[PDB]
Structures are given as C-alpha cells and as structure tokens.
Amino acid sequence: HLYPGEVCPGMDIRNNLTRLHELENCSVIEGHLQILLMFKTRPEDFRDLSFPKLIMITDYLLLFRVYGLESLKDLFPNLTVIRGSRLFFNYALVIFEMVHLKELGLYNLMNITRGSVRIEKNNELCYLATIDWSRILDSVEDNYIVLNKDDNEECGDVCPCPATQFVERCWTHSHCQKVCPTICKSHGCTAEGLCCHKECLGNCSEPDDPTKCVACRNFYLDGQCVETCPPPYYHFQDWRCVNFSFCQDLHFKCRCHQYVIHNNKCIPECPSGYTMNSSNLMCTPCLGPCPKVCQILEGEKTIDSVTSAQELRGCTVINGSLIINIRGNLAAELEANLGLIEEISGFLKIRRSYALVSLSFFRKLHLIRGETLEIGNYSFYALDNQNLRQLWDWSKHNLTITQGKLFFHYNPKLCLSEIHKMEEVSGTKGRQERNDIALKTNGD
Amino acid sequence: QASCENELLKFSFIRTSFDKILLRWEPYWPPDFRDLLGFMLFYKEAPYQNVVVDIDPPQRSHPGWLMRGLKPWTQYAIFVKTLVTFSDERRTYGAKSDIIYVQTDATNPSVPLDPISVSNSSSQIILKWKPPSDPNGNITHYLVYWERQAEDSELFELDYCLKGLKLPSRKELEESSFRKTFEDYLHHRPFEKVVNKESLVISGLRHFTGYRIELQACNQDSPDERCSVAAYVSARTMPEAKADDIVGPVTHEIFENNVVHLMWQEPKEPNGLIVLYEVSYRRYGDEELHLCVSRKHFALERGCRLRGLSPGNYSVRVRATSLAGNGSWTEPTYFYVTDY
Amino acid sequence: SLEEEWAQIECEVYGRGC
C-alpha cells in the first residue's frame, strides 16, 4: 500500500487534454507537472476529469492560462505533499494568469516541503485570504500573492471548522482547511486528533503505524515509511529506495542522466573528484584530472563566443566535432574553457574566426580520431582565418591525426613552414592530394 | 586573397513565410568544376533600403537555401557570393549577386499590455492600454468585448446581522527572468472596434455592477481576421448616491394584541443588492433601539414584527444597507399603540 | 509548406538523407 498506483515522470501539457489522461493510473509524479496554454477548452470538458490517485508531486505544480477550469477540487482532490526537489525560480506552486479559476480547491494539501507559492493575476480567484499558509509552508515570507480578485475586495468567502485577528480557515465553500494539534508538529493527525507515526506526513489512515501513512517523510520502501533505506537498497530521487538492479538498468537505458552509485545514493552523475567505475557503477576517486567524456548532438558543435564554449568547461575527451567560428579576455578565458581537451573523435574546423591569433588554447590536445569527416574526408579544416599566425608550438607540443586529410585556405598570416611541420608531426604527409593545402593564398 | 568576383548570379525563386525564407539562384560552374568550394549567403536585418551561411556545392539543378530564425514583418538584405579556389592558372574569380530585399510575412500579434480600467462616472468605464510590444505587423484595430457579471449567488441567501457581518466594501533578475519565460511561453457579447486609439469610454452601463472586459489587438480586418490572444481586466462602475433611498412612508398596522406589522417599499433598483434593513425607533425620552432585518426575514414577514412594548408614541426610521454603503434614513413616522 | 519544399529540394540537389 501507501502508493497503490505507478510512478509517472514529470510532464508538460499544452493545447490539448489527450496527454492529461496519462496520469490515470499512477499515484506519485516523479517530476514536475505543468498545465499551460489551453485556449479552446470549456468547463464542459473538465466536469468528468478527475485524478483521485495523485498523492504527491516531487518538484512543483505550474498552471498558466487554462480556459474553462473553475476549480482544482475536481482535478487533484488527494494531492497531499509537494516536495519541491527542484523548484521553478524558487517557487513550488505557481498559478499565473489562470483565468476562469474561482477557488483553489486543493483541500487535501498539507505540506510544501521546500519552496514558495506564486499565485497571481487571476481576476476571478477567491478563497485566498482564508488559507493559513503558515501551516503549510515553513517560511511564508517568500510568498507572492498579488493582483488577483482577492486583493480588490469582491469575494464572499463563506465556509462552515477551526480558525486561527482570528479568522476562519477554509479551502473552498464546502471544504475547510485541516489543522492538526500543535503536538502533531508535521506528522499529521487523523480525524479524531491522534498523532500519526514519526514517519508519516500530512495524513494517515491509522494513527501510530508506519505502513498506514499517506506520504512518507523520509523514504518509501515496500509500502513502509523508513528513516534510511537498509542495505542492499540505495536512496533515489531523495524520496524512495531502489535496489542495485534498478539503478543499473536506468544507467544502461541511456545506451540522459546515466546514474551512478556513491555513498549509498543512485545519483545522476559522480561529483567532482570522482569517476564512474565500469564494473560496479561506483564513483571512485581519481588521480590527477578526472576524465570527463562529453557528448554533443549530431556530432557537431559551433563555438561562436565564450558563452557557447562555457558548456565545454572541464571536458577532456569529445565524442564529436568542434567548429570554431569566433569573430570577437579572449584567447585566455578560451584556454580556461577548452584548455583541457585531450582527444576529439570527429574533426576540428576553424572557419572565419577573425579574433584568433593562435590555437594555443587547445593546450592539452594530442589526438584527433577523425572517425566522422567533413565532405571530402577532412579532419582538420581551416578556412579564411584573417589573423591565424601559429597553430601549435611544435618544439614543445605534439599531435596525431588518425584519419582524414588537412585543408588550409585563405590563411594570409600562416607560413607554409607551419603547415608542413604540422604535416610532418601528424603523420598525414602521404594523405594530402593536389588542391588540398592551398599554395599561394597562405603566408602573405 | 580578396573578393574580386566579376560575373553575376541571379535569384530565380523566393518564397517567404512568417519566420522562414527559401531562396534559389541560377547554377554556377567555373571552367574547372573542382574549383568551387561552395557558396556563401549573407543576410542582415535592413529596415531601410540604403544598404554569413556556408552552403555546400550542389552535385554534378538550381541550388537553394532556407533561413529559419527570422523575425516576422521585417526586411532582410540578402546576397549570395561564390567561393572559388586560387588555381595555378589565371584565377576564375567567380560570381556574386546583387543585394536583394525580402520581407517576411506577418503572424498573430502579441497581447496588448497594461490595461487599466477606471470608472469615473456611474455608467462609464474609461479603458486605457499600450500597444503590444510585438506587433508582428501593422496593427489595424483593437477589439474590446465587455460582459456583465452577475452578483454572487451565495450573497443572495445569507443572514448578515448575525455574527460575521463583515461585508466587503465593494534579486530583480529572478523576477525578470520569470516574467520573460512566461511571456516567451506565448510563442454575441457587446464589443467595439477601436481604430487608431489606445483608449475607449464605455457608455450605457448599469450602475454599480461588475464588468469583465476582454481586449485584443488585430492587424487584419476584412480578409479572414486573424489576431492575438486576449488580455482580461475587471471593472466596477461607481454607484448612484440616491439609488439606495427607500421611497414611500413606512406603513404601519397594529393588531388587537399590541402586534405591529411594518411595511416599506423595497428599493426596486439598488446598488447590486440589499443586504439588510435597519429599523431604529425611540419614543419620547427613551434610548434608541435598533433592529436588523435580513433578506429572508423581510421576505417571510413581508416587513417586520414588533410586540411587547411599553405604552407611548414611537417614531420609526428605516434605512437600507447595500453593497455600496448605507442608504438614506427615511423620514420618521409616528405611531401610537393601543394601551387598553 | 516551406519545410517540405526545402526537404524535397535537399533530396533533389544536395541528396542529404532522402
């Protein structure tokens, strides 16, 4: 029990209701839920739409510009906890420009573990001042609730329930906010007022019992809230416990967040100073620079400035290709971003890079595989570099190109001695053909 | 080393969209077809006519290219220059093309921003707004719809003089990025077409009622109107000062058992609705006594009941309370109960 | 549409994919 349904991943829903039916079976969303930009819908469409099995949202809930939705009391009547693992600009529940919304209706909401609430610009939203956000969020100083119908006094908020100037607290017209006794600090209480177990959170069907909770405070395992997952289980998503096979399968399905095990945690990536072991998927310390293989889309990436090269920071091996088209602290911060690469799988191309004075920023580069080549079988491409004066200091640097040819054209300030020295060093002397290295448009 | 193209290239097919442009040009081949390293296509945003992408060579008819990241309703200057190789003989300088100007189509404009509604009079709503930040074309006219919103059905069946009588008196970078993300997410009611204006006065409205106003901007009128998403605002007209006055003197009737029935004409056209009726009476020398009547009380008893009072002459004043505020006190009416 | 026409022309003259 404690989560009878499956575990959906987070999703964004736009313009249609078809995808919203994917939450029919699952009990807890292991992700964020976004509902936005639905213009043609009408209140005749939301009447028979209900998800009573949704109990828990890990990161956040966002609602933006949905037409025809009058209350969430029919969509999420059992949503209890919004953990807020990763927030939306430090907001765990955002309801923005949500027209036609009259009342909130989240009458089962009990706790927002981390984050704030941003409810704004709903010109028909009532029942907002009758909500005790001090009982839900830990810190209410970061809420942002303005420019709605509640501020411009137009709402007849009437509700039957304990109050807390003392004012009645209620969610909807016929539902009142559930307030537990102060002894039940965060463990929630049953209807009769008895505190739940120490691991419960929000609600419990049977007080003083771990397996009769509604949402676990620390971790979930086999329908039993637990303080820490006993071995051989590893924590996962900071909210559940999974065995080794599950994390290994998640890692293998990327062959994206290929998960690794470290300090009894199945985390998306090894922290700094560690590398994944290919045998048992455990982050082990590394000597010297920790290898960081970086993959790129379509086997090609264009670096137009420092900002585009920022993503490459710390990489050592690239399983793709690099295209440098930088036209304008240069040649120094570029060394910070790219001065660690030690191998490129595809091809390296420098094209119309006016600012570059030399390729010294590729300080550690020693091997270009050349498995994927530009049309014509080119592994090193150099086209129209108005200021390229030196490729690499060949007295101190070394390089080797496994496959492909060279192509130098329109490099006015590149002496033919440098190109011939590169041909000698890389070992591609017997590879170039006629009209491959331009003769009388280099070194002038 | 330099670009000294002498021959000429010509465009033969140009087709635009709201954010894409597809061009073609006549094929080019130098005497040695191996000298062509490809084409270069220059394009920039040129608002006035007083004025780089590399394309692989075609296989050995008309080549072409397609730009995708262009803004709608903008003018672009485009020209194509070939890229040749400095051969061992008299160089084939290649060809380039003249600068041409291409304008992308239009799309649905952005939402009008900053709508402000102010009710200066009791029947007119002055609505002001600023033009949308992304017109995406020549904004022909704005469309304003307005709808009367009925009063809450809950307020029609509530006893108000009971306890609970509080009537309604009817790090900047993070926020900037938040609003930028939310604006980037966006890619027969009585109405009015506002042409060449940014403000409109709404006339002929019920006094002190809620109005929901929907505002749009449009850049095409007759051929299948296409335009933006709506911006919603709310307003409420100011109330008439004397509209809550109760007319007609307070009729009284006395039963044989010192039972008093009070009739008074309902305020046919009040400011929204009448929440309660206050009846204040005080005889010669006594202290003032007030009594509340709810809507259900007045409906059930067709007025008010009075019983069990000391002999004397009483003066009755009745005041009606509405959403806008307290009404005018009725002129006192004097009655004398039978003392047997 | 423009995208399909561009794909057809890339089939024709440049031959990529297709």
Numbering used by the authors:
A (entry chain A): 1 to 160, 169 to 172, 177 to 267, 274 to 346, 349 to 464
B (entry chain B): 465 to 515, 531 to 539, 549 to 658, 696 to 712, 758 to 910
C (entry chain C): 1 to 18
Provide the publication's sentences verbatim.
Insulin binds and activates a receptor tyrosine kinase, the insulin receptor (IR), at the cell surface. The activated IR triggers signaling cascades to control many facets of physiology. A previously reported selective IR agonist without sequence homology to insulin, S597, activates IR and mimics insulin’s action on glycemic control. To elucidate the mechanism of IR activation by S597, we determine cryo-EM structures of the mouse IR/S597 complex.
In order to explore how the S597-component-2 engages the IR, we synthesized the N-terminal 20 residues of S597 comprising only component-2 and the linker (S597-N20) and determined the cryo-EM structure of full-length mouse IR/S597-component-2 complex at overall 3.6 Å resolution. The resolution for one-half of the IR/S597-component-2 complex was further improved to 3.5 Å resolution after symmetry expansion and focused refinement. Structural comparison between S597-component-2 bound IR and apo-IR revealed no major structural differences, suggesting that the S597-component-2 alone cannot induce the conformational change of IR required for signaling. Additional strong densities were identified at the side-surface of the FnIII-1 domain of each IR protomer that could be unambiguously assigned to the S597-component-2. Fourteen residues that constitute the S597-component-2 could be built into a cryo-EM map based on clear side-chain densities. The model shows that S597-component-2, assuming a short α-helical conformation, packs tightly against the side-surface of the FnIII-1 domain of IR mainly through hydrophobic interactions. Particularly, Leu2, Trp6, Ile9, and Tyr14 of S597-component-2 positioned along one side of the helix make strong interactions with several hydrophobic residues in the FnIII-1 domain of IR, including Leu486, Pro537, Pro549, Gly550, and Leu552. In addition, Glu5 of S597-component-2 and Arg16 of the linker region form salt bridges with Arg479 and Asp535 of the IR FnIII-1 domain, respectively, further contributing to the strong IR/S597-component-2 interaction. Our structure shows that the S597-component-2 binds to a similar surface on the FnIII-1 domain of IR as that used for the site-2 insulin binding. Some key residues that are critical for IR/S597-component-2 interaction, including Tyr477, Arg479, Lys484, Arg488, Trp551, and Arg554, are not conserved in the IGF1R, partially explaining the specificity of S597 on IR activation.
